[PDB]
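Example with several molecule types.
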Amino acid sequence: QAQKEAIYRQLDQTTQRFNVGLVAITDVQNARAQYDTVLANEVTARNNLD
Amino acid sequence: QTVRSSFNNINASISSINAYKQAVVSAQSSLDAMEAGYSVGTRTIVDVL
Amino acid sequence: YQATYDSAKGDLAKAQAAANIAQLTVNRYQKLLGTQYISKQEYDQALAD
Amino acid sequence: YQATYDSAKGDLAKAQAAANIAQLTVNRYQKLLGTQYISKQEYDQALAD
Amino acid sequence: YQATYDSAKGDLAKAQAAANIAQLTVNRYQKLLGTQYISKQEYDQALAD
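Resulting structure tokens for the full complex:
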């Protein structure tokens, strides 16, 4: 859960940077991929507890 | 217990599928970036490989 | 005065070479920027240079 | 005196270009500062520049 | 005037050393440019230098 919060904040920061315009679209795609990976990891951990 | 575990496995697999699809999209974007840079003249063949 | 003129011509040649490389970099970055593969900050920096 | 005037105008143009790029960068940093996504040290450095 | 001449000759030697190392780097990059193992941007920068 802590990792998910941190990764979501990082993704939001990257999206803000792109919207203002500081980084290319590849960084945004990479951040979104990392966020999706973290979501899958959270689902796996929940199922492990169950 | 087996039924419960097998039910949870499917949802885990769905989430993994979504994550891997997004990762594939990001990798394709990076490859297109490398190819465009190579064609323009700012990259080498090793980068696109 | 001939020596002074030659020195001025050399300085002009150096400045022209710097301008040429800057223009080449600007053209390449403008080629890349059209479809969002480099940051706008890099393009602005190249334009300023 | 015409040559001296031209040289001074060129120097002024160079300074203006540097000021323009610095202003663009500081404007982008100020835009990003609202949501606490850049350290205040970076914004202070950009403002000083 | 002899002292001034010596100072000028020393400055010329310094400039010649810088030119020599730049030319060596350019010559080394030229061979790699043939097989697409160095990006054209680096070669252009070396040529400008």
